[model samples]
Target: SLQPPPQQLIVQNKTIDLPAVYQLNGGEEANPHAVKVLKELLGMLISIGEKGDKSVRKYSRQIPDHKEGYYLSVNEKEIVLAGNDERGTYYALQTFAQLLKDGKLPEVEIKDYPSVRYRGVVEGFYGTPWSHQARLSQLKFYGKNKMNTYIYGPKDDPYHSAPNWRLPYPDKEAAQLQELVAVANENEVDFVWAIHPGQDIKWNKEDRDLLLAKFEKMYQLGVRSFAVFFDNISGEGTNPQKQAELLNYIDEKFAQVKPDINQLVMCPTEYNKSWSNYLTTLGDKLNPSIQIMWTGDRVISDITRDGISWINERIKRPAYIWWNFPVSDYVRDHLLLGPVYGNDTTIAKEMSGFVTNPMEHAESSKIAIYSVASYAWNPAKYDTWQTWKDAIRTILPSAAEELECFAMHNSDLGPNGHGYRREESMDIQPAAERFLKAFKEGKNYDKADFETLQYTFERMKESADILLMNTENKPLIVEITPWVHQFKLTAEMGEEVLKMVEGNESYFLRKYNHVKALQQQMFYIDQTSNQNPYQPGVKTATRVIKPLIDRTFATVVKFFNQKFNAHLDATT
Candidate 1:
């Protein structure tokens, strides 16, 4: 399925069965990187026909337009993948890739472009930076999804900030960036190298020269875009007066002075509305061309009209959004596999850019990153649940349903300092609530509510095994095993609690006692692994299923104590 539906599509009453190999044409007039991508795609999916006269597959761009727009056409005779620019031409092949399925494609015409001007990921989270291998995979994923920006600003990357901001990367470290930039170039993604000089920088010429020298060193490594981050710091860096001066100096001396460079961008220490103090100083003093980053209303919040207007008026420019979703820095034990919702579609025009701060688990993060791509491409036509489902299926075609069921419970981050939450187990919440209520008021679950709960319980049971057994995404499975193990154990608790309510009390109580063993297993995992500073635990179903079972189990024990008049209990 097409993840981001095209802007304008015309489906004809015809189809074309593609050859196992077709003659490919067009390179001299196309983006060289686009040509390379086309060949790579053909090499993976279907090999090109032996270079000779045959049914030709053509790709070329008509204009070097600003917007990354593409025009795709398919018919019985030939297929055309055209674009208005180099990046657009590369994107054309990505959409064409969707059509290369079942050895056939629908005869259709599509014209598409991203609704948002700037869309991509920023590796700007706290804790460990992603491995080089992970970052490379991310660039390829971004290219395929038409996400054209990748800010290389991992907060913990020592060379990018603090102690080493004044120093260039050692040869070994520098070469890795060389490879990353080349790959990013091939993918048509802007590899933005951010220098966090604000943390310890002096405003005078010595530190200023050191910052520019660092930029020169990075530029030599093929980084064309640059950003300066002042977030999460104290003392001198917190002052916007100094921040504006540093940014304005970089703007005049480096970004503008250099040819083929992106405009200077900055991440103010007060990146959220609640934290703002000197934003107007930045607005009046900082050059309008310099892009400023903000995290909407709160440190962790959804974008809104009021929030956007408040910042936009102060910044004197549309803010570059630093959306803090799917970034589990504050809640490391959970995986945010929910739909990208809450931000209104109409707010697309309110911000100049929208970049995600993703979790350190790179491969698993793709589940949400995939949806971010679709949402940014066409926010107006964005279908949150639909894109979430598509992401699951596309990420692991063999086990989408299992992943979807797994994600429903894994969605919500258990109570945190941020007060941010997502709807978890939403589809089956009513059914779970009904069963919880019936048992609380009486001894037996109603037949209909029992059946409703049974359906979901069975699904959660199957979801764990299906996802754990999946081989297509081994890295994702590896990254998420701790949480999956917790999910499986939670489902076991749910299964036994249901049995505890029905049949003989003594028989199921013995069966339900195994839940204590499951709890030890669950509690051990929650404590032993992913032990971050915040409300630490491997959490699942905190919003719906687990709470339902937890309260229901307590009620069942209460009734057993009342009816049998024996001190009956299970360990917490």
Candidate 2:
């Protein structure tokens, strides 16, 4: 259930039979989008009829007084779905699909609408762009999770970024782009094709014409939304007047020719408040119809309401967030498996939309993206940990409990091989400390505590083992394999320490050698792969494991006749 919980749900003890067929009414052109989605969800065809013995769900525009939301009512006889528009109706069916428990529908009423207008993933990272299959698969994932937008702007896509922005996509590439737009439309996800032309474009008519022509080609491919990015490029040749003129030209020209164009977004070079001139010029001269993207106070930092308000005032409109989280392009070795956080709950109402930049390990990014969907849909009601649990359940349903255990040990974010805080209720470090304190002091020590610690790590091992064995996406598993191996070994070492404390003198040697072997592996990993060229890997937890290992050696050696140094000396 990575999907957001319905805003207003009245659960019933009784379950009703879900209809194999559905009848839709009161939408323009019969709302085929909703019908297609419902068919996939229910695994049956949607026949057009007003009456049926099969349970019925109606899609209609005329709800008592609602204009921008949906009402889902389920009884023994029928499930009436009413929405303000096609988008609302489509979302209602999404909710219906998520609400299904074992192919049976719970009798309930749900009134739901998105808190933010744009909610989805932005493939805007710097590493190898996602393969065509990955993008197509992710669109269905987005639709199922109630995310309505996907920004296509991989930093490495030649036509999307840098000097190639002026050239039209090749025939093969153009067909792929066209397919993406079609798939996105079928799933009701907006395909916002973004171009980063600021890296080389000059403010001349030639450059402007080329840029507009590029957009024209995408428009012909059925892309309805577009973004012009000036972020991450040099400020040289970038000023308010010239930049505004460039963005305004796209806005005006696109509006004049492509009436179906839905949104025009501009990412100013000065995306932060630290530089104000570029923003001021764009706000004053750029078309108000165009949306502006902002990356809060820092490029990759928490977003707050006050921070958004300050930027909104400066830009004179609600800012679209280009959230850079769970993205490991800068830190290639550490895959961020944390829940989406640091976003101001109140900022949802003031923001036009929020799209998170994902990790280079695209499949692994789903765990974080799922929570982001929950937060964006209903920030006021968002529950970080609960949503995270639901994400695990949804993404890795078979291994939810075990994956959660592994996730707890690997969810903290850091600056550079350091620590900030835990994303969940507990992490491995503090939990290990509790066992260490109990073993050393013998105060409040119990067999159950040691047993609990052992079981916890065992569960983590099991979870990682299952994921490595069964996950369809093998590349992500390979990327995270070293960490998972470390987790398992660390847990084994902890259990070995406990065994030594039980007066198994030989276990001391076993525990010492195990920790030393783990340390050796970790050291090698750190030297070659623990970090990327740009930032530190998630070695903080592994680094802390060495101290615990040293402590374990000290404790066990004191209990037995062992000749070892005071400290392990070698670092992990």
Candidate 3:
């Protein structure tokens, strides 16, 4: 399933494209964090410098040599910059990062620039000190990976805690969280201090008061950006207006809220005009400058393949996208990694900002981070087969490419190739059976079997690729991107495919379809059959128990079993 044509590799610093040179000004400041960021930027520049782009080169200028902050100038001759301020230096790196695609940097002569200026990272996670260190490690990784901004809004929980990242309350957790923010800043990662009030609605006057005190304390400690959690509040779904009103009330009640916040990552419910109305009310009652983040399900693509423009136009506010990917079971069940084939990049380009909203589903958060950060760095980057192969290699590298191929196909088809979102229509059994049968017959990862499996993989890849291609690149649409909508339009395709694979003599088809049909009918049966004292005519002794017969015709094939991969000729 791996895609061909490896990314081009170029040694750095050889051909530096010094687009527009400007003499550096002020000496390196004492701000320890910014200097660390500069060092990383310099390191990546050196490696990429070997590509022989002579037009690009780094120069440190101080005082009368240049100016106070960093600035980049794109012109016909070179990409010039002034100063090395964290804000400016990071922005300069973004330009260079964009130049290198597939390990090869692009060259251009026309001028380019930055308008809104400030770029930062705003992090929120539930993990241990190691995870905190890993998050800082990501800031360095980001420089090479094409990210200019990094935010650290870590929770004050220990390494193995429930809800993974929720901080232990009172002043202690708050102080520890402050230290985490300081550490990030000291490492050149921009600090986006998150101050979640009433986490999971576990709120009270005291909790609120303690949160506010923590907020002020962090502010005094130089923490700038803030994020608050209102997500996972179930009632908001039922009464959005009241939800809006409650938020407005809170906004009005809090006076110190509007102080010096640079940005606010407000997670709200509902993606439509209603939540927008709520935010607007909050602005009127509280502070208006706050920025909002919308979980894809809340507004954009889950229910409707709506882009950021549709959201912004409706809300009259700039929006950020919150996608769920590389899912795992951390605190909650995440979207796991194999489903990367979807996520229509075409639509993602429309949003103001993008952040993968990974659930705290165990230590599996790293999987989501890799997937999200990879896409966030360049929304257009994708090579499903290649990426999947690389991931499989990383996860179980010693395993043969053949094993990875089976794993990829099994995973993709487990949801019955219907993509990740659960649907009643797609019966996963038939497809899984066919793959299992093929696996059973294979005589080892021999030339023949490996070659045959490769062909099967290509077919699946083609089908999956078509699904994503048809979504028109909308992030929302990408949710359903794996299989073309055409397959959905034809409900009988799975049945047809099953019949074709099983042939006339196999009774497996009948059993498989019977189970499928029964499961489909079961939902309706549940509607009437599950009553307390039992409804008048709905109660049935044998009829209610009759469904158990469906499981009697079971043909369970262990897809994950190595014996299935023992090859047709091998008895093992």
Candidate 3 deviant stretches above 4 angstroms = 1-26, 29-85, 91-130, 139-175, 187-190, 193-211, 234-260, 271-287, 298-310, 330-335, 339-341, 344-350, 359-371, 377-572
Q: With candidate 1 superimposed using the best TM-score fit, by how many Å does residue 492's alpha carbon deviate from the native?
A: 1.2
TM-scores of the candidates are 0.93, 0.87, 0.50
Clashing pairs in 2: none
Model 1 misplacement above 4 A? 19-25, 41-66
- Scanning candidate 2 in windows of ten residues, the lowest lDDT window is 47-56
* 456: Cα error in model 1, Å: 2.2
lDDT of 3: 0.38
Clash pairs, model 1 backbone: none
Once fitted onto the true fold, the runs of candidate 2 whose alpha carbons sit more than 4 angstroms away are 20-28, 41-68, 273-276, 417-431, 434-449, 471-479, 500-507, 524-540, 543-547, 554-571
Worst 10 residues of 3 by lDDT: 536-545
lDDT of 2 by residue, 1-572 (tens): 42676667777778877666655443334347876766666532232211221222343332323323566777675656655555666777778777787788787867677788788888888777888988988998888788887999887788887778888889999999999988888878889888877754556678778877877778888999988777767846577688777777777777767767776787877776555555766777877778888777776667887778888876787788878778777666554777777777877768888888888776678888888888888898899889988887776676677767767766655444323343532544576677678767645556665676667656756776776775655655666777776667666665666666665435656666776776676666667665556754435344344366567657656545434434443332
lDDT of 3 by residue, 1-572 (tens): 11111022223334344323233322243233433443444312221111112322343322112111333433333434332334334434444444544443333321222211223233444333234445545555444333334444445533112242233345765565566666555444445554434324433466445555655555666666655545544532333344444444445544345664444555555533434355544334434444556655433234134544556554455565655343212211112334344455555334545554443332223333444444543344455545545544433344335333323322221221213342111232343344544545542223443334344435444444444443332332233222122222112323333333333324644544544554444434435432223221111111111211222222132221243452211110
lDDT of 1 at 73: 76
